[PDB]
Symmetry: C3
Subunit: 446 residues, 3 copies
């Protein structure tokens, strides 16, 4: 499964076992709730049974009215999308004349139908709740039969269950301005969402993937309010569809790499800034700089190409030889020699500088390693916690073998006299350019 390599030379680590599930595009469905506009109830009197049904009908009638009022490091390199552009684009089409009537007619006999909208796009539609028929054909008839003092108390409770979902939906949208993420259990129950996946135009491998991770799918989905014309409430559900699946993926962890002299100043530091998730797709490598935004379950990675850059395969060369000519690896430089630790998939990188106390501890044995100054690594095999200064990090206990690639720290090849100490997004070649400009200009004057 998962493995890990720590490169001592550039103070970074690569975890390799993972598999992709990249969100590549969107699927939009139209969800409808058929609900009825009720005429004024003539049930006077405060008989205890009566007050409950009148109160419940009133909660429903207000909820409809409430709904009517409501309808009226390198992250900076990424670029700016519009998360709900697709679903909103579908939502606006539903406003056109007799589009609801088409949807309404399509779901008249079943609860699922494919409708060709006026713009030509065919979308799945679902009737997930039928309060129109329940109220008009079961509840109100029982009220007239029993003259509003219901003999059988269970029918009012049967209504209260049906009505709660419409009340929770109207409560959520009252607070979200009609666009929510993740999509709630009231908007789409778990069984409904699983059912939409079976009917989506994707391979069984994709259907099986989504069905086994509905909670991830749910979190990557949007719920867009659309209309309440006629007797219908309609909102668009925007689902992620994963167009790239099961390609190899790897995560890069990076930490500052500094010289190890104890004197307070005069230390110089260097950090790889390309930390994040890498997944090769379609002959290229997709890079996700904010690895927090990617969600991992088992050994499969769900990222979103909205948060990616599309890079040449040669990026991989930065891990093995940072100075290679084929790709200019991104680095940052400073004189701030602060101690910290980065917990990786299968261990921990410890950048220990200055006078910091740095230790690795076992749950049973106590402290079992004290670090020297510099960037080092420890496997999660014998180690349970790592303590850097006053910070105690627990280590990941995911199983897998890690291997330490010894090497001379890269920072030793720079002398502090010509080293450019404020560069936030420089490269291997860019630092050399500033060194040669600085090494010639100072030398030439003498």
């Amino acid at each position: 499964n998962i493995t890990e390599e720590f490169y001592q030379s550039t103070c970074s680590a690569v975890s390799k076992g993972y598999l992709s599930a990249l969100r590549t595009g969107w699927y939009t469905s139209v969800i409808t709730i058929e609900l009825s506009n009720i005429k004024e109830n003539k049930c006077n009197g405060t008989d205890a049974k009566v007050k409950l049904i009148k109160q419940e009908l009133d909660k429903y009638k207000n909820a409809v009215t409430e709904l009517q009022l409501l309808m009226q490091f390198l992250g900076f390199l990424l670029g700016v999308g519009s998360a709900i552009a697709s679903g909103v684009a579908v939502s606006k089409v539903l406003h056109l004349e007799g589009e609801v009537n088409k949807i309404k007619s399509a779901l008249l006999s079943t609860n699922k139908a494919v409708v060709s909208l006026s713009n030509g796009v065919s979308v799945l539609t679902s009737k997930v709740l039928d309060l129109k028929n329940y109220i008009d054909k079961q509840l109100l008839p029982i009220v007239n039969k029993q003259s509003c003092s219901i003999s059988n108390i269970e029918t009012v409770i049967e209504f209260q269950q049906k009505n709660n979902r419409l009340l929770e939906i109207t409560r959520e949208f009252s607070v979200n301005a009609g666009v929510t993420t993740p999509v709630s259990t009231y908007m789409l129950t778990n069984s409904e969402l699983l059912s939409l996946i079976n009917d989506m135009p994707i391979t069984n491998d994709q259907k099986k993937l989504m069905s086994n991770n509905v909670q991830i799918v749910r979190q990557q989905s949007y719920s867009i309010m659309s209309i309440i014309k006629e007797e219908v409430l309609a909102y668009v559900v925007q689902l992620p569809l994963y167009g790239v699946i099961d390609t190899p993926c790897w995560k890069l962890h990076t930490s500052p790499l500094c010289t190890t002299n104890t004197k307070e100043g005069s230390n110089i530091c260097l950090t790889r800034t390309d930390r994040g998730w890498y997944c090769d797709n379609a002959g290229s490598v997709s890079f996700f700089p904010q690895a927090e935004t990617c969600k991992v379950q088992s050994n499969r990675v769900f990222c979103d190409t909205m948060n990616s850059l599309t890079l040449p395969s040669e990026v991989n060369l930065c891990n093995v030889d940072i100075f290679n000519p084929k790709y200019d690896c991104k680095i940052m430089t400073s004189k701030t020699d602060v101690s910290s630790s980065v917990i990786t998939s299968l261990g921990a990188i410890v950048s220990c500088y200055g006078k910091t106390k740095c230790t690795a501890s076992n749950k049973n044995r106590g402290i079992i390693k004290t670090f020297s100054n510099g960037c080092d690594y420890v496997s999660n095999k014998g180690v349970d916690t790592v303590s850097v200064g006053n910070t105690l990090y627990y280590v990941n206990k995911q199983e897998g073998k890690s291997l330490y690639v010894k090497g001379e720290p890269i920072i030793n090849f720079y002398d502090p006299l010509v080293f450019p100490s404020d560069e936030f997004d420089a490269s291997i070649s860019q630092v050399n350019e500033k060194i040669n400009q600085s090494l010639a200009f100072i030398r030439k004057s003498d």
Copy 2:
């Protein structure tokens, strides 16, 4: 309505049709809920009916006890406010010297009153729910009368219905350390919120705006737990008051602009960094750099002046002539020749460099444009998606005319040999000055 102007020379676009709704200050109201403190019911029984009221009384009593325990790019330029300082200042006034009795007696005859507090501040107070009369004078008498075994299952259900709102209010406060935003429908029902707007000392133009956008109003509001002394639960509701309405607003979109030469390295880049929302305000320009925090409904923009800078009107010149001397436009420079796209209101900016495949497609026609190297623009008229590398962007489909301003790319005026390639918040004049300073060391020393 809305329009959009794309400037090819500086690789940016401006969306212009919008109208402002700026949060300018706060309005604080006190919401009170009347509660009865219940003593431990000495009600034993293994009847399913009795167990139901006992569970409900216990659920209510714990909520009271739960509430009792509760008593004890250019974003960095912005500056730091204290969001709920106004509401907290009101809440603190409620803890001292029995101020609740004043509210409690003021709300004795109606459910709405204006109270002048110890500090002199007059605040609206509202009694939104009277659970005391139900519990102490209808329910518990029935319990002691029928020896805790309620005959009618409806009496227990009415209780759990009456009891429900207090339980959710206490839930929200339990999970948010007594400060919630947005303000929920349990905190303030939709009908209650519309009524408070009518009672606020603001214009009908302000009242009409808030009333038609409660879902935004709720999102810009805070609900602050204050006290539960003397059979009263009180919390402060902090509502936004919109002091600037209907002034022109425009959003600036920017993307990196790089040279298009074939050499893989040695390419140069330049990006405008003042992206964000600008709303003309009181003779100046209020700038909101983090456009996520602003909310747009139809063609109306709700922003928060807490997240703004107040700038001279001359800011606008960065859109028309970036090199003018009167205002120093902010930029960043690099050699990081990466491809990306920025989706605008009415189209998409495509920054396509290197060997990346960049295309814009229509839902019916397929691919309809292949982009060349450089920063270009596309209207959302015929285009539905834009694809940059392995990233597929859907374009915004709002109607409006977008307009293309031809121009020579600004970055071509620099030679790559003296270009300062790592400037994170530089300006037009600051970059010119570092080249000018670097041009001096060469000319005077070399010809020497």
Copy 3:
């Protein structure tokens, strides 16, 4: 009543000193178990409303069980990367092993609290907070099979949905969060359950009293991790904060940009301290929190997380009293961006007013009572209620406490605008002096030659 604040005109910053520490230093993990019966498919034919509710509820419960089974299967950049739930998950991984539940299940059959040693050697406390099995299997279903699914008394169905309700919310929270919840809700751990868990935690009475009086903050620093529902047990891990540093001095540093105040629109020079945030001394060094948002304040106590800190030498305070001191090189950033702004402190407001901006401080009764000139100034929250900087209206904190004005000449006046390096995001006073010295030498040495 020990909260105070000092404003340093010299470097346009302010320090709030009265506070007390409560740092999360590590984690305590317990396993919470709920006893469940797996309900097999009911054979209820009939459309009587009573049957309709019973069947509706039984299917509602079965969905939750099925749903839960699906679940088993400035200076922030310097901080470093933790794994927040690595500890809780490590416990959760062990519970997946064959028959680890039986160890748990037998330990809690006679009481509701027991310590179980797992396969990996870890002894962890386990708690049974709810027994839904006995109601369903020995009270509800027997009545169903006896009365041929036609329930006589509607009270038993309302009894059921109430018994069933908590498990339904627990499964909802997990279903929407991919099995990891924070803060830990009252459905995950009721208020009395948590207070009881605190008593059994391996901590001092100072720690128990601290956590017991701030459960709502404890909840905000806790995680709840779904693990298993095998063989009539639902188990999830609750990850609780244990506060290893308590009642040590803490102070908040507020900083603002400091610029020259000349009338010329351009050509101004600026300078800002970047070490704003919360500071707490603990083990003879100073734990620094640059992201003051992650720290929560209740009255005079600061709840922070050592995961979001840097550990710095005690010499950091030297930056507050004499920024040019030799023992620590204070971090600052430099710019030419002459923008007006305001930073509200604990006991007042810093007003950095530059250019032509209208800057004002007002009282609720008197109206406008002070207009600021160009430069860095300060105002106490005593007489002042609001502060207006340009078109932004700031309300000031009204916490009681004395603030004091440390008069001094702004540091920015000691630099000449001609040699000032104006693009530095994390340089130091000495690093900038060195850039002045390298540039002052090239100009001085060239004139001699």
